[PDB]
Amino acid sequence: DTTQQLSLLKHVLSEDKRPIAFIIAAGCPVSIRHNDAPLIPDVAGLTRKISDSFGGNPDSLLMKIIQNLKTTIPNPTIEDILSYIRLLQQIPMSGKIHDVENSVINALEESICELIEEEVNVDLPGNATPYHKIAAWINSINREHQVEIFTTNYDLLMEQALEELNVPYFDGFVGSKRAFFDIRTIEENKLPSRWSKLWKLHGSINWQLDKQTQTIWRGTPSKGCSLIHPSHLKYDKMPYLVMMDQLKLFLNQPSAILITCGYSYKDQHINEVLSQGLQTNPNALIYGLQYDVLENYQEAKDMALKRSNLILLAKDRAIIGKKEGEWKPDPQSSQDNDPLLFFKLGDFQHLASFLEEISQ
Amino acid sequence: DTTQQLSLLKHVLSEDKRPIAFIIAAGCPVSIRHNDAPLIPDVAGLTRKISDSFGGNPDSLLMKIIQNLKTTIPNPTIEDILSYIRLLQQIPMSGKIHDVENSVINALEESICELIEEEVNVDLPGNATPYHKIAAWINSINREHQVEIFTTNYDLLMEQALEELNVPYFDGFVGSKRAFFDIRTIEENKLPSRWSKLWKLHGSINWQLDKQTQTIWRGTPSKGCSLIHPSHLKYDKMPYLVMMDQLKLFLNQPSAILITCGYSYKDQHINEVLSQGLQTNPNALIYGLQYDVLENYQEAKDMALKRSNLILLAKDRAIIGKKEGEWKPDPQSSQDNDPLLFFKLGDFQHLASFLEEISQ
Amino acid sequence: DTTQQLSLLKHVLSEDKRPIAFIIAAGCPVSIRHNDAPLIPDVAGLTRKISDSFGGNPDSLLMKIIQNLKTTIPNPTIEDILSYIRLLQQIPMSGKIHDVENSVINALEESICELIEEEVNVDLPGNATPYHKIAAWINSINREHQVEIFTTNYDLLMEQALEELNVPYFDGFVGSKRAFFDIRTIEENKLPSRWSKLWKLHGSINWQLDKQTQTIWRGTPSKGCSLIHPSHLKYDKMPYLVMMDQLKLFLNQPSAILITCGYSYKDQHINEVLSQGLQTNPNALIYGLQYDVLENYQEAKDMALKRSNLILLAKDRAIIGKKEGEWKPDPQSSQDNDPLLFFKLGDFQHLASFLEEISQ
């Protein structure tokens, strides 16, 4: 099954008459090897670091909140904890839920934000990283349709890689000193055709908010970024709806394509916007790829079974147009012992190799 | 001054080359006189009746909630109370804030919904009501641009008036038995040019939700309608964002017009969407009219002073393109005593008379 | 004969350049199996249960009327009984024909109306019913020509199946509270091309009449629906002529197609409108299919023998262009005993399977 999918992917990517996009999740940053350790320990890692940082003491508010969430959420995460804490802050919660913290909840969330900021504030080492290969592919060939990239991460790796190889892009903000969030140009949609576009759905580490005018601006990472929010903030002093609107508006164009790398389809709003855009535009496609085994992704299988234009591919099997298929007999593993049919090409490093092979 | 604005409104409404809209708030239902009493006691009455219904006993949860809200917001209302109760429901609030009601908060909100449903579930008496006059104006002349109506009320007066005079309209839902919320046709925007469109921003009394499939549908008013929400519900099993997108998308059309009757600009989301639409489309106009005195409307003054495409008119003064003007010397009141210059036409009955005169 | 007709039907249905229609009679509701019993016992059942409901007592008016009709009508039915009763009450029939019932005829027709109402007031069980498959076929592919459905039944199965699978349609009425019968839009014929159209020729259980203004409207099934009339009512406070006219007007577009399922051609008006429209447009086709043996249908054979563009098909033989043919030798039944050549595809469940196969 490797040959057919590889060839068709080559054909669809080689054409320059179709829009292309990406979705980048924690899989891409974790795929970078450093000191035989993950560059960023992903959502589970960033959750466990907070859990161990405050220790196992039951007197801590954060451990109490985690065990409270265990009753409702089987596997609570940092996103859920942050949303829960912000929610508790929204109302004068002086009750027994916050009896231990009459006002220490603000300090707890402040420390969580600071530690996340310290953890994800790194840079790309060297010029052999996969992001450099991806940017090289992007600027290798001039195409009449712009290449967009959607990022659910907080790190600035992709911006750095796009600047080092000198690929222009527009991420929403326009300006030099304290770039503001320009709105009109976003929906004019008449940027130069050579530009890429980098949308950050979940915010970033450098976004900040000035409460004096209650307006946001992209600057430099300072002590506490107030738009670290994983899509949990105020009403439309908020660009989240606009980035989602941009994803949706992108999906509705004819012969649209999309590729997800490192996404586990565990976020509801992304999933429903993908579903809406996918049904509203039959021509829309999602060539979602999972580095993990498909058996761990019930949500992905449900999505694939509900729509016919979602060519979901996994490590072991594949779902091509509401029908599920497995790997055909091929000598994927030369060794006789454990002849596992694994599609190793779904790894992000291997994906970058694939793109650079296409480009050259 | 009356002559200039009256004539220009007549000319701009008489033309059929421009889109027209309305925004209808509690002022329109309250302007109907019945038994020398208000037909609907408006938001202040709708709140005070609820407060008096549970009595002045401090043991009641609702009064404790009201006094809790007094500490943060000076003037709590039914919308704020409902949002606050729903918010408290969102997390396992078993603490001292909800110590009195371990689980009685759900009962409290259920009773609030039932009582408000009983209060706003009435019908139009006779055929002399102003809504009938407005519908007569709408169907009096065929215009190449559809006339839309945005309603923030919960009553079904507008639908009944449009039905009795046989004016077709599309309110989002398509079907007969238990009509679903059709999404695609909303954004295709290719309905017959004769149809009006009636959008319900704050929900309505007949919308209901089935939790088995977590999908909404408009049917008949049963005991407990789960979409009474004044824009406080789940993520996009929710039509609120779609109606908001429709308001925005309408505002961006060339030479767009809008009229607000009974609106006090006391909702932040409505206000910011109006402002953003005004900015993105300078040609957009808002001929907002207030029945009350201008001195009570700080938000209206602010919006009118920071934008130029908003010809706000009040009972006493007017704001025409970022410049504030008052009533010029005219014999508005014949009586010598208290020669108050009041633009009395801003009341909804007088507005209906004005439209009737224009149509005939 | 199976292969050729099956292939030709596949080709004619697969094309998106032609109008398509359906006619749905009691065969489709009865084809549903429930508790090893018919979901609706069809016209014979709905007549015999009325007969047994009033018992075998000769003192009953209804039994007297049935035996009176036996003299003229060999096999009287519920339609004939209802028409006869409405005729009897149309004039002051105080004579010996109504000597037993000075005023009890109104009570008799009432009780008949409610009894029919409860007997036909059911819902679709599950999601494996054939109607769901038909709607899935309808919305499976976008076609430039709208798919209409004509129904002679009183049940609301088709509406429920269409709206559960998110299929829009227009059944004549426009509105939300008490949807009125809009006339102009019916003949404008400029609805969005994506919409289906569901016409109810024989009325329905939810249509009602307000005598204060003598106007009809679709609402919710209440106690006694005054428009269950099987095309026997007042003059043009009556939409029957309009739906008949709509069938006629549909027959006149070029390359028009039509399929009847469960129809026995026992209605004079439908038969003559089919014949006349088939005369006027020789390009019109009717692929009438009978689940029963053709020998029971003299009317269908007569009509097929009068016209060349009516490819009538039966269980045993077929009539293709005024020439009658029988089943060619094929191993339809594997068993040697009773090698009956029966076209099993004429059953409605099998038709739903056929449409599902075409769609997939």
Short mmCIF file of C-alpha atoms in Angstrom, two decimals, chain C residues 101-279:
data_model
loop_
_atom_site.label_atom_id
_atom_site.label_comp_id
_atom_site.label_asym_id
_atom_site.label_seq_id
_atom_site.Cartn_x
_atom_site.Cartn_y
_atom_site.Cartn_z
CA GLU C 101 -79.18 9.44 11.98
CA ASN C 102 -81.07 12.72 12.15
CA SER C 103 -77.79 14.36 13.21
CA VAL C 104 -75.53 11.39 14.10
CA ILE C 105 -73.84 11.33 10.69
CA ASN C 106 -71.61 14.17 11.87
CA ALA C 107 -70.67 12.12 14.92
CA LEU C 108 -69.96 9.10 12.73
CA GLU C 109 -67.67 10.97 10.35
CA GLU C 110 -65.98 12.61 13.33
CA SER C 111 -65.26 9.31 15.07
CA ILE C 112 -63.94 7.98 11.77
CA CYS C 113 -61.61 10.98 11.52
CA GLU C 114 -60.14 10.60 15.00
CA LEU C 115 -59.85 6.83 14.72
CA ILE C 116 -57.92 7.16 11.46
CA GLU C 117 -55.87 9.86 13.15
CA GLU C 118 -54.65 7.62 15.97
CA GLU C 119 -54.21 4.69 13.61
CA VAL C 120 -51.86 6.58 11.28
CA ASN C 121 -50.09 8.72 13.92
CA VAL C 122 -46.84 6.79 14.36
CA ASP C 123 -43.13 7.38 13.82
CA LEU C 124 -40.14 5.78 12.13
CA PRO C 125 -38.43 3.16 14.34
CA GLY C 126 -34.64 3.11 14.19
CA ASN C 127 -32.38 4.19 11.34
CA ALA C 128 -32.52 1.05 9.17
CA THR C 129 -35.90 1.84 7.61
CA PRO C 130 -36.06 2.13 3.80
CA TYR C 131 -37.09 5.79 3.91
CA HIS C 132 -33.74 6.59 5.50
CA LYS C 133 -32.01 4.79 2.64
CA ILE C 134 -34.03 6.76 0.07
CA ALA C 135 -33.19 10.08 1.72
CA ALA C 136 -29.55 9.01 1.89
CA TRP C 137 -29.66 8.40 -1.85
CA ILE C 138 -31.31 11.77 -2.43
CA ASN C 139 -28.72 13.76 -0.51
CA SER C 140 -25.81 11.51 -1.54
CA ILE C 141 -25.16 13.37 -4.80
CA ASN C 142 -25.78 16.98 -5.79
CA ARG C 143 -27.90 17.15 -8.96
CA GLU C 144 -28.85 20.19 -11.01
CA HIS C 145 -32.51 19.08 -11.06
CA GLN C 146 -34.54 18.96 -7.87
CA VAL C 147 -35.93 15.62 -6.71
CA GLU C 148 -39.64 15.84 -5.91
CA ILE C 149 -41.79 13.37 -4.00
CA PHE C 150 -45.56 13.01 -4.34
CA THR C 151 -47.34 11.28 -1.47
CA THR C 152 -50.89 9.95 -1.31
CA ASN C 153 -50.52 8.89 2.33
CA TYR C 154 -51.41 10.63 5.57
CA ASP C 155 -48.40 9.51 7.60
CA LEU C 156 -45.47 11.84 8.22
CA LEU C 157 -42.76 9.23 7.63
CA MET C 158 -41.17 10.89 4.61
CA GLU C 159 -40.76 14.25 6.33
CA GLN C 160 -39.16 12.67 9.39
CA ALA C 161 -36.77 10.61 7.30
CA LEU C 162 -35.76 13.61 5.20
CA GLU C 163 -35.15 15.92 8.15
CA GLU C 164 -33.30 13.40 10.31
CA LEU C 165 -30.65 12.99 7.61
CA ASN C 166 -30.44 16.78 7.12
CA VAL C 167 -32.26 17.11 3.78
CA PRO C 168 -34.09 20.42 3.19
CA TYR C 169 -37.48 20.45 1.52
CA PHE C 170 -40.45 22.69 0.76
CA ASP C 171 -43.97 21.33 1.18
CA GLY C 172 -45.91 24.44 0.24
CA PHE C 173 -46.23 26.13 3.60
CA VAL C 174 -43.99 28.97 4.77
CA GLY C 175 -43.82 30.06 8.39
CA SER C 176 -42.95 29.11 11.93
CA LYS C 177 -45.85 29.54 14.36
CA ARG C 178 -48.86 28.62 12.17
CA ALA C 179 -47.34 28.27 8.73
CA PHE C 180 -49.77 29.52 6.11
CA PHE C 181 -50.27 28.16 2.61
CA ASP C 182 -48.17 30.50 0.48
CA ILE C 183 -49.43 30.52 -3.10
CA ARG C 184 -47.20 32.89 -5.06
CA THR C 185 -43.92 31.13 -4.33
CA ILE C 186 -45.39 27.86 -5.59
CA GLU C 187 -45.77 29.20 -9.13
CA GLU C 188 -42.73 31.49 -9.07
CA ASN C 189 -40.69 28.26 -8.98
CA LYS C 190 -37.38 29.86 -8.00
CA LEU C 191 -36.48 28.01 -4.82
CA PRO C 192 -32.81 27.10 -4.30
CA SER C 193 -31.86 24.27 -6.64
CA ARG C 194 -30.56 22.23 -3.70
CA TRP C 195 -33.99 21.92 -2.06
CA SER C 196 -36.26 18.95 -2.54
CA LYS C 197 -40.03 19.40 -2.75
CA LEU C 198 -42.57 17.22 -0.94
CA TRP C 199 -46.15 17.56 -2.20
CA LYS C 200 -49.01 15.91 -0.32
CA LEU C 201 -51.83 15.33 -2.81
CA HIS C 202 -54.26 13.63 -0.40
CA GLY C 203 -53.66 15.94 2.52
CA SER C 204 -52.05 14.98 5.81
CA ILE C 205 -52.81 14.52 9.48
CA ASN C 206 -51.33 17.86 10.60
CA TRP C 207 -53.18 20.13 8.17
CA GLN C 208 -55.96 22.01 9.92
CA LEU C 209 -58.60 24.59 9.07
CA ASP C 210 -59.69 27.71 10.95
CA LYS C 211 -63.30 28.50 10.08
CA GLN C 212 -63.11 32.06 11.44
CA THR C 213 -61.17 33.15 8.34
CA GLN C 214 -61.73 29.93 6.34
CA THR C 215 -58.00 29.55 5.69
CA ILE C 216 -55.81 26.49 6.19
CA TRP C 217 -52.43 26.16 7.88
CA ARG C 218 -50.00 23.43 8.86
CA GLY C 219 -49.49 23.16 12.60
CA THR C 220 -49.33 20.22 14.98
CA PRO C 221 -51.74 17.27 15.04
CA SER C 222 -54.65 18.34 17.24
CA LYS C 223 -57.98 16.71 18.05
CA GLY C 224 -59.61 16.31 14.66
CA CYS C 225 -57.80 17.45 11.52
CA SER C 226 -60.20 18.88 8.95
CA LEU C 227 -57.99 18.27 5.90
CA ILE C 228 -57.54 14.52 5.83
CA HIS C 229 -59.81 14.71 2.80
CA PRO C 230 -58.77 12.26 0.05
CA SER C 231 -59.37 14.97 -2.55
CA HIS C 232 -63.01 15.69 -1.67
CA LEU C 233 -63.49 19.17 -0.22
CA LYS C 234 -64.56 22.71 -1.04
CA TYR C 235 -63.59 24.70 -4.13
CA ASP C 236 -60.25 26.37 -4.85
CA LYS C 237 -59.64 26.98 1.46
CA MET C 238 -58.35 24.03 -0.55
CA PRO C 239 -54.87 23.25 -1.94
CA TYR C 240 -55.70 20.02 -3.78
CA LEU C 241 -55.95 21.64 -7.20
CA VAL C 242 -52.59 23.32 -6.69
CA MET C 243 -50.76 20.08 -5.90
CA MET C 244 -52.44 18.36 -8.85
CA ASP C 245 -51.42 21.30 -11.02
CA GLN C 246 -47.87 20.91 -9.72
CA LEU C 247 -47.78 17.28 -10.80
CA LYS C 248 -49.10 18.33 -14.21
CA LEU C 249 -46.56 21.13 -14.60
CA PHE C 250 -43.77 18.77 -13.59
CA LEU C 251 -44.80 16.30 -16.26
CA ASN C 252 -44.27 18.91 -19.01
CA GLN C 253 -40.53 19.61 -18.68
CA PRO C 254 -38.48 17.74 -21.30
CA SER C 255 -36.86 14.39 -20.54
CA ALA C 256 -38.99 14.13 -17.40
CA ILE C 257 -39.03 10.86 -15.45
CA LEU C 258 -41.37 9.48 -12.82
CA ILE C 259 -41.56 6.35 -10.67
CA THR C 260 -44.63 5.01 -8.88
CA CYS C 261 -44.18 2.61 -5.96
CA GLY C 262 -47.15 1.02 -4.23
CA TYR C 263 -49.62 2.66 -6.62
CA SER C 264 -52.44 0.50 -7.98
CA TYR C 265 -53.82 3.06 -10.47
CA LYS C 266 -57.22 2.78 -8.79
CA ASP C 267 -57.72 6.56 -8.55
CA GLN C 268 -59.45 8.15 -11.53
CA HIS C 269 -58.14 11.71 -11.21
CA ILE C 270 -54.49 10.75 -10.79
CA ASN C 271 -54.80 8.33 -13.70
CA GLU C 272 -56.35 10.89 -16.04
CA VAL C 273 -53.81 13.58 -15.11
CA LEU C 274 -51.01 11.10 -15.77
CA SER C 275 -52.59 10.19 -19.11
CA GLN C 276 -53.19 13.78 -20.21
CA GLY C 277 -49.74 15.00 -19.21
CA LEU C 278 -48.28 11.94 -20.91
CA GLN C 279 -50.18 12.88 -24.07
#
